[PDB]
Design a protein around this nucleic acid. Sequence first.
RNA 1: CGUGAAGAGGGAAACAACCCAGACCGCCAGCUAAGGUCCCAAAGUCAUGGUUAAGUGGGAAACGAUGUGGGAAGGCCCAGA
RNA 2: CUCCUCCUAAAGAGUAACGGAGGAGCACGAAGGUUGGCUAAUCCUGGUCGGACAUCAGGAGGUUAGUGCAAUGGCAUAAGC
RNA 3: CGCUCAACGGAUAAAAGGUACUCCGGGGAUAACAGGCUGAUACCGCCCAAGAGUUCAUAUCGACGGCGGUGUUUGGCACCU
RNA 4: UGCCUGGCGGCCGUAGCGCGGUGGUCCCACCUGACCCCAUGCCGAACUCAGAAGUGAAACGCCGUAGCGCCGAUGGUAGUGUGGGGUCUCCCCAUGCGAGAGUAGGGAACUGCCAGGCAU
Lengths: 94, 116, 58, 78, 135
Amino acid sequence: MFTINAEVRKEQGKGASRRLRAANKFPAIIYGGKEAPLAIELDHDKVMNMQAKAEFYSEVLTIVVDGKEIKVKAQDVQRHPYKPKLQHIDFVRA
Amino acid sequence: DKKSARIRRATRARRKLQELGATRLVVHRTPRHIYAQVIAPNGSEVLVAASTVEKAIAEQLKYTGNKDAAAAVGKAVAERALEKGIKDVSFDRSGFQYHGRVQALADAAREAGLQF
Amino acid sequence: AKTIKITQTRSAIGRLPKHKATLLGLGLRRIGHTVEREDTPAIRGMINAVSFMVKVEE
Amino acid sequence: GSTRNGRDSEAKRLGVKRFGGESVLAGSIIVRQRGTKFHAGANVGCGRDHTLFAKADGKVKFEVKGPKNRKFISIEAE
Amino acid sequence: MLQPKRTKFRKMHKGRNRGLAQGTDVSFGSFGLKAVGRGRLTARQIEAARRAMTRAVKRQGKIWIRVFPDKPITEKPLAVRGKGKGNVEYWVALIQPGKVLYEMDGVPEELAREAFKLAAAKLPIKTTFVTKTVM
RNA sequence: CGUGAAGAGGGAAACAACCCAGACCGCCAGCUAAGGUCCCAAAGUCAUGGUUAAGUGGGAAACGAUGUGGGAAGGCCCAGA
RNA sequence: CUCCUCCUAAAGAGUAACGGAGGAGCACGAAGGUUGGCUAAUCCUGGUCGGACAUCAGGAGGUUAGUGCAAUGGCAUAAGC
RNA sequence: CGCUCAACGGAUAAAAGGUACUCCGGGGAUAACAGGCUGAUACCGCCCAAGAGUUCAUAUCGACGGCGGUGUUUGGCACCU
RNA sequence: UGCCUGGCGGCCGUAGCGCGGUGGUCCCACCUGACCCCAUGCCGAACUCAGAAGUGAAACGCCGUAGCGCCGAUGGUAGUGUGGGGUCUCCCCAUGCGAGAGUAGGGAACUGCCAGGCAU
Ligand SMILES: [K+]
Ligand SMILES: [K+]
Ligand SMILES: [K+]
Ligand SMILES: [K+]
Ligand SMILES: [K+]
Ligand SMILES: [K+]
Ligand SMILES: [K+]
Ligand SMILES: [K+]
Ligand SMILES: [K+]
Ligand SMILES: [K+]
Ligand SMILES: [K+]
Ligand SMILES: [K+]
Ligand SMILES: [K+]
Ligand SMILES: [K+]
Ligand SMILES: [Mg+2]
Ligand SMILES: [Mg+2]
Ligand SMILES: [Mg+2]
Ligand SMILES: [Mg+2]
Ligand SMILES: [Mg+2]
Ligand SMILES: [Mg+2]
Ligand SMILES: [Mg+2]
Ligand SMILES: [Mg+2]
Ligand SMILES: [Mg+2]
Ligand SMILES: [Mg+2]
Ligand SMILES: [Mg+2]
Ligand SMILES: [Mg+2]
Ligand SMILES: [Mg+2]
Ligand SMILES: [Mg+2]
Ligand SMILES: [Mg+2]
Ligand SMILES: [Mg+2]
Ligand SMILES: [Mg+2]
Ligand SMILES: [Mg+2]
Ligand SMILES: [Mg+2]
Ligand SMILES: [Mg+2]
Ligand SMILES: [Mg+2]
Ligand SMILES: [Mg+2]
Ligand SMILES: [Mg+2]
Ligand SMILES: [Mg+2]
Ligand SMILES: [Mg+2]
Ligand SMILES: [Mg+2]
Ligand SMILES: [Mg+2]
Ligand SMILES: [Mg+2]
Ligand SMILES: [Mg+2]
Ligand SMILES: [Mg+2]
Ligand SMILES: [Mg+2]
Ligand SMILES: [Mg+2]
Ligand SMILES: [Mg+2]
Ligand SMILES: [Mg+2]
Ligand SMILES: [Mg+2]
Ligand SMILES: [Mg+2]
Ligand SMILES: [Mg+2]
Ligand SMILES: [Mg+2]
Ligand SMILES: [Mg+2]
Ligand SMILES: [Mg+2]
């Protein structure tokens, strides 16, 4: 039942990623299968609240990007070194 | 392993010959047969060759694995090399002792005309 | 062919030697000096090296 | 008090003297080294202190060759 | 008081302490005390905090120390002017933000929080209470 | 690496070495830099939206506290919190 | 207090301190040349005296050995035997 | 071929001390006093609370450790003379 | 033309280990003898010579198989040249360069010259 709304990233790299996290979003990547990887931006507060549930890391999530729905599983998460924040997430296509 | 031991034995002289840019006369010996190749300095092209597994050479020998066969192969490889107009090679014993069949082949090649 | 105008906007006092050499290669002599140069990747690289102290009119 | 340290030896000015692509004359030293960090390739010699030097005029070339991924220096005739 | 049983060398350059920590996850227990600040932790401090923690939990559960004081610190005695490096006097661990310093298991979370607060009161660096995460 | 030394001018109250900037001479012309625009003292008592009530601004730590502004959640609640 | 090796030394060279650590003031007519050959430590198992460790045999292992003497860089085509 | 000329670019073939009886040329390039910078040390506060206090951590002391203030001892430096 | 084998190279783990299977007409290997050429600091073990009864057992080659080794993105993170800034022991902003590790995944090599055997 986990649904996450995402945007396609229009800029990549250190500066753009830091600007995202200063604007209270964070970057993430969807890869796997035969499709090309998709780099996305997520809303930090909503996703941070969702990932508190243990089922976030075991269930099949749905990421809505540009209207299309993609079934994924959380694969890796980079956390802030000491704040309760998220830096990045890997999603693998399910 | 005997083969690995012999390859280790042969490596130093082969590397020296490659550094010198010489045309090699490489000998290979087995209990039943003996083989000779003349190899270009690049190490990957064979100019002439002769062995006891060739019918034209083996038909004139009682046994292909002795000193008489070695001498026949040496003479044949030297004659073919001279026909191609080579005349100047370096002997590569390939880790076999310079002795017996290998030496008989080398002596036959020298007598037939190869300079080494 | 196409040319661009480059003006020096800040002083050269105390800049790195490579930066002073780049200003020399652009032909810039003083604050407010404007020069006209051919638009090539080499010229663009010189501008990039000293971009904090020059301005470009295209 | 005092210290039991305080010693050192003079710097030996080792290293690469001619880099890849440089045109050299025969005899030129290409690298000074302790032992063979670099190995002698075509038209290069290895001296008694393992100095690699040009045996012909040409351009310096570095490459990695062989089963041990070793580094060789050769001279390309120009 | 932790200290290496033996070392290659007696004295170490001062160095610096930049960067973020490695070892930022609760890896052995369920709860952790994590550094938020940057600094040095002396062996005496590590041991004072360990004592405070252990007495708070009444020697129940299990406690891990994730840091070890492997850097020797020298001092020059009083009224000395040069003349060689001073004498090793104590040992420290370098701490960067994010470093998990202690972990606990086998106790309730409220008790672990209390014990860790008592411990943090012994340390020269700001800290925060963390819990194990599944990923 | 930069400046002083061997470098004046403007700023940082005053302050070789910081910031801006390199004084050939004259002008009772003009534009700017750093830094500034209530009076001393040249220029906004300028405009719009907020925050602070401590003269904080205009000296400092672990740590303490219903100071006050903002944000995302959570528990209970007209079946009465 | 001269000489050698490492680090400091900021991935070319060089780079200071009464900075951090170690060595030299020789040895060898073979321990030098060359040709031919060869490959280590350690452990396990079995075996007279013989035992934790002698020599023998097999296996594992793969240079964890070796290098006339410090340390570094090298060394199987061995520079090791 | 002859030098531990080892103070190792080697003053001579050949060399130790005292001066409070002292003297000259110099230096605040360099010590002793006082100032300055610093604040390890010193002194004075504070935080946590093991415990002592019949019970009771906080009447009164406060162990293991943590954070500051002063310029105030012992010192460091060598900036002024 | 294809298959198999031997020799010399290119390349230097996507190519190496392990595990399982498989090959003897030829080739290779083990193999059979040794008075002799030659040899053992003893030993025909090795080296060497003279051979061809036997066997593919070992070795070797080939085939299969991810249990390993090995290779390996995208994204993010670390660092950093230049310019600017802060609460300056450490960091942030603009711009440029951008890892290592880890993840998805790949992966049981490919190839040149000459010679021989078989089929064709
Ligand atoms: K100047
Ligand atoms: K005030
Ligand atoms: K109130
Ligand atoms: K260095
Ligand atoms: K010898
Ligand atoms: K002297
Ligand atoms: K005297
Ligand atoms: K006297
Ligand atoms: K103080
Ligand atoms: K002070
Ligand atoms: K106080
Ligand atoms: K009481
Ligand atoms: K005086
Ligand atoms: K493989
Ligand atoms: Mg940046
Ligand atoms: Mg300036
Ligand atoms: Mg050195
Ligand atoms: Mg450093
Ligand atoms: Mg580190
Ligand atoms: Mg002067
Ligand atoms: Mg000035
Ligand atoms: Mg001034
Ligand atoms: Mg001021
Ligand atoms: Mg003034
Ligand atoms: Mg104006
Ligand atoms: Mg006015
Ligand atoms: Mg107004
Ligand atoms: Mg004030
Ligand atoms: Mg260097
Ligand atoms: Mg450098
Ligand atoms: Mg210098
Ligand atoms: Mg100097
Ligand atoms: Mg020195
Ligand atoms: Mg000594
Ligand atoms: Mg040899
Ligand atoms: Mg001298
Ligand atoms: Mg008297
Ligand atoms: Mg006098
Ligand atoms: Mg004077
Ligand atoms: Mg002075
Ligand atoms: Mg005194
Ligand atoms: Mg004084
Ligand atoms: Mg009290
Ligand atoms: Mg106390
Ligand atoms: Mg005073
Ligand atoms: Mg004083
Ligand atoms: Mg001084
Ligand atoms: Mg004075
Ligand atoms: Mg004065
Ligand atoms: Mg035999
Ligand atoms: Mg078999
Ligand atoms: Mg990347
Ligand atoms: Mg990578
Ligand atoms: Mg295989």
